[PDB]
Each structure stands twice: as structure tokens, then as C-alpha cells.
Amino acid sequence: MRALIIVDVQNDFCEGGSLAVTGGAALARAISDYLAEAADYHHVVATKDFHIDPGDHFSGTPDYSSSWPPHCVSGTPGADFHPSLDTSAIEAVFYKGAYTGAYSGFEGVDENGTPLLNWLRQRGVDEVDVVGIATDHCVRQTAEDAVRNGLATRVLVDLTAGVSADTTVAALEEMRTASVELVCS
Ligand SMILES: [Fe+2]
């Protein structure tokens, strides 16, 4: 009935990465050891940005709004899980963005055909907690898609890392107005 969804906790989104979010490395290890304390999840899954050829999504002259420097490229280290981050508990991985810019974990597919919402409902999951990077981008988008698709949804705000303070505030407010619950873990 309840699952935890770990969003985009990848090398390119941590310190050193092409799209470094300050606090990313620290956040990977805070999520491990949670997982070790509580817990209380019927299931645990992760999502990954994973680009083979997404076209205009990448640019040499990026605007950090619709075009980005190359990141999470298939066959490079940027695309892998940050090495903090116990992977033991993770039952399935959902990849999105192979040929396209992706905005939400709900665009991800696992290694057989399977889209995220399908995998969850087949297991009778009806409520989700969301954690990961970035609060103001893919976390926000994944949380509001969870609610659009009929799931009861929390974000564990202490277990997210956002890009900027001003945009993180705007994002937390839009999440409440969409009816996501914002709590500490
Ligand atoms: Fe991307």
C-alpha cells in the first residue's frame, strides 16, 4: 500500500557533476540510513534521468530552462547513483529521457516494458512518499503527477535538495496548492 520513490539521486546532480545541486552528496547519505531507521514501506523504487539522444534538451549555449549542458548520458559516470546511497533496498529502477527531455518520474519505464504508475498499481500501491533532487524541479513534478494520477502523496522535505532558496519556496507553495503533503521524515 505505501511506497517510497527516490528521485534522480545521480552523479551529475551532485557536487562535481555537470548539473551539481549543493547538498546532493550529503542528501544521498541521509537517504541511506533513513531506509535503515524507518522504513515502513511496502515497496522502494528509484528513478533516473537517462539520455541516449534527447536532441534540443542539450545545448552548447544552455539556458537552464529548456536547454541544459549534457548530463546523465548513457554509458558515462554522471548517469549512475551517487556512491553514498545504499542500493540494497531498491526493488526497481525507472529510466526516462532516452530520446527526449523528461520532467517527471512518471515518464520513467523499468527494464521490461513497465511505466511507473503501472508497476505501483499492480502491487496495490495507493500512497507514495517522494524524496531526492531537485525539490524545485523533478521532485515537484513527480509529486504533482502522483496526485493527478490518484495517489495519496507526501514529500519528505528534509530529504530533498533544491537549487535555490527562492525557487524552492515557490515550488513548496505550488505543491500544497496541488494538495501534496509536506512533512519531515
Ligand atoms: Fe535531463
Author numbering: 1 to 185
Task: Show me the paper's own sentences about this structure.
Pyrazinamide (PZA), which is an analogue of nicotinamide, is an important first-line drug used in the short-course treatment of tuberculosis. PZA, which is a prodrug devoid of significant antibacterial activity, is metabolized into its active form, pyrazinoic acid (POA), by the amidase activity of the Mycobacterium tuberculosis nicotinamidase/pyrazinamidase (referred to as MtPncA), encoded by the pncA gene. The structure of PncA is made of a six-stranded parallel beta-sheet with helices packed on either side to form an α/β single domain. The substrate binding cavity in MtPncA is a small crevice of approximately 10 Å deep and 7 Å wide, which is delineated on one side by a catalytic triad made of residues Lys96 at the end of strand β3, Asp8 at the end of strand β1 and Cys138 at the N-ter extremity of helice α3.
The crystal structure of PncA was determined to 2.2 Å resolution by molecular replacement using PhPncA as search model. The asymmetric unit contained a single protein molecule. The metal ion present in PncA was finally identified by ICP-MS analysis, showing that MtPncA contained iron at a concentration of 180 µM for a total protein concentration of 260 µM in the assay. A final refinement considering Fe2+ as the ion present in PncA showed that the iron atom was coordinated in a distorted tetragonal bipyramidal arrangement by (i) the side chains of residues His51, His71 and two water molecules, HOH220 and 221 in equatorial position, and (ii) the side chains of Asp49 and His57 in axial position. Thus, our results are rather in agreement with the previous report of Zhang et al. who found that the M. tuberculosis pyrazinamidase contains iron and manganese with a molar ratio 1∶1, as opposed to what was speculated from the study of the pyrazinamidase of P. horikoshii which hypothesized that the metal ion present in PncA is a zinc playing a direct catalytic role by promoting a hydroxyl ion involved in hydrolysis of the drug. Strikingly, and as opposed to previous observations made in PhPncA and AbPncA, the side chain of the key catalytic residue Cys138 in MtPncA was observed to be oriented not toward the centre of the binding cavity but, instead, toward the side chain of Lys96. Notably, His51 and His71 correspond to the hinge of the loop encompassing residues 52 to 70. This loop, which constitutes a flap closing the binding cavity, is locked by the third coordination bond established between His57 and Fe2+.
